[PDB]
């Protein structure tokens, strides 16, 4: 588990069995479990805005909690 691409984000490296070859790191599998996937656009269009929506909604939530403590005071 580490960043082998040099994106910043961690990836998982999976090494399949040594029965294939008497050679190290042949038969690899590199994946992020999102977009990055190496080995041996309507979908990809709507996720960032929806995530930003979640973040804005989270900010509002927290703001209202603060507003409510003020009124109690």
């Amino acid at each position: 588990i580490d960043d082998f691409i040099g994106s910043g984000t961690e990836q998982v490296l999976l090494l399949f069995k040594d029965s294939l070859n008497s050679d190290c790191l042949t038969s690899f599998k590199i994946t992020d479990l999102g977009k990055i996937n190496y080995s041996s656009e309507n979908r990809y269009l709507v996720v960032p805005p929806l995530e930003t929506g979640l973040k804005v909604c989270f900010s509002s939530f927290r703001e209202l909690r603060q507003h409510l403590l003020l009124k109690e005071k």
Binding site: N42, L45, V46, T52, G53, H67, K71
Partner: protein, 370 residues
């Protein structure tokens, strides 16, 4: 009410007198679904001539650039009632001016319903959505197989009010918005407009391919005008009615006074053979008894087809348009440049929107009609 016992309660519900002597108010003040903290100390007597007014730092931010207005209002205003009335009305001004601070989408019926509705449309339609989810841009196809886009800009409430629709085509689009109407509804309206114009699109695309369109370049879909080139250094511009495109357009020619005469004559004699069952090009070709050039670019690449005053093609939209009535010069010009020259000469005299005088290169009579 009349008196500031009940009228004060009715118009600042959220101000609680803290002291027995109604001297220290505290609490909240309301504006645009928003309460702001506030603690408004009077003297021993009910005098705003002298009165403290302290706030939340959130409120101080929003009353920056009004501190003088507030201080004036405290001194000039009779009672506390009217003070609060004026203060609220001033907050409505402040926030409505800084309207860019707002439009927060509600979590329950926004992000979900819009995805439901886009699912109802089809995901092949959507081409863009903004990370604020404020902007979307959507696509549709002709019977011809042509892409036409539509931008919406949407508020904190999509389904309550209309979405701001920006669409290419030249005639104004009308969208019957209800709270019950939706993306498929307004999409069906767009397709309706498309299929109605279909003829218009086909006429202007047929133009763009099969003739040397000159004075729009990379034309929009809104554009009804089409300055076509024919021969060399003479042109025809053509504004066509969208609703009746195949019908005759408003038409006229630039070019050499000795070249253009016969074209006008021939157009007048053949215009009755205009027929709205053929195409624009298929009628013009047999009306004007000619063919067009398809972009004479390679041969006359650098022939000097420029103003011959400033030596430029494209002077701020302007094209070389005005020519010499002479076989030996034929020199194109610009309106602006040839006016500025001819305005000076002692030779030149002006009629109503006309300037007479000498072609710069050959010194022969040339006429300019502004």
């Amino acid at each position: 009410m009349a008196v500031t016992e009940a009228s004060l309660l009715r118009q600042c519900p959220l101000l609680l007198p803290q002291n027995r002597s109604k001297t220290v108010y505290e609490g909240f003040i309301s504006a645009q679904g928003r309460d702001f903290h506030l603690r408004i100390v009077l003297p021993e007597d009910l005098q705003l001539k002298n009165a403290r007014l302290l706030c939340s730092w959130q409120l101080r931010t929003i009353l920056s650039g009004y501190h003088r207005i507030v201080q004036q209002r405290m001194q000039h205003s009779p009672d506390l009632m009217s003070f609060m009335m004026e203060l609220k009305m001033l907050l409505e001004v402040a926030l409505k001016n800084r309207q860019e601070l707002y439009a927060l989408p509600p979590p329950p019926q926004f992000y979900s319903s819009l995805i439901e509705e886009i699912g109802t449309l089809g995901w092949d339609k959507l081409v863009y959505a903004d990370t604020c989810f404020s902007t979307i841009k959507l696509k549709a196809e002709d019977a011809s197989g042509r892409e036409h886009l539509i931008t919406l800009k949407l508020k904190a409430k999509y389904p309550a009010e209309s979405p701001d629709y920006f669409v290419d085509f030249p005639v104004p689009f009308c969208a019957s918005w209800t709270p019950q109407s939706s993306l498929i509804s307004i999409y069906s309206q767009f397709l309706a407009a498309i299929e109605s114009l279909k003829a218009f699109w086909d006429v202007m695309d047929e133009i763009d391919e099969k003739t040397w369109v000159l004075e729009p370049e990379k034309p929009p879909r809104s554009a009804t005008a089409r300055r076509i080139a024919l021969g060399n250094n003479v042109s025809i511009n053509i504004e066509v009615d969208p609703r009746h495109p195949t019908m005759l357009p408003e038409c006229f020619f630039l070019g050499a006074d000795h070249v253009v005469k016969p074209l006008g004559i021939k157009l007048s004699r053949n215009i009755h053979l205009w027929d709205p069952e053929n195409s624009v090009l298929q009628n013009l070709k047999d009306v004007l008894e000619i063919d067009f050039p398809a972009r004479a670019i390679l041969e006359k690449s650098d022939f000097t087809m420029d103003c011959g005053i400033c030596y430029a093609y494209q002077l701020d939209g302007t094209i070389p348009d005005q020519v010499c009535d002479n076989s030996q010069c034929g020199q194109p010009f610009h309106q602006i440049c040839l006016y500025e020259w001819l305005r000076g000469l002692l030779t030149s005299r002006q009629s109503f929107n006309i300037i007479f005088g000498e072609c710069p290169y050959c010194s022969k009579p040339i006429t300019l009609k502004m």
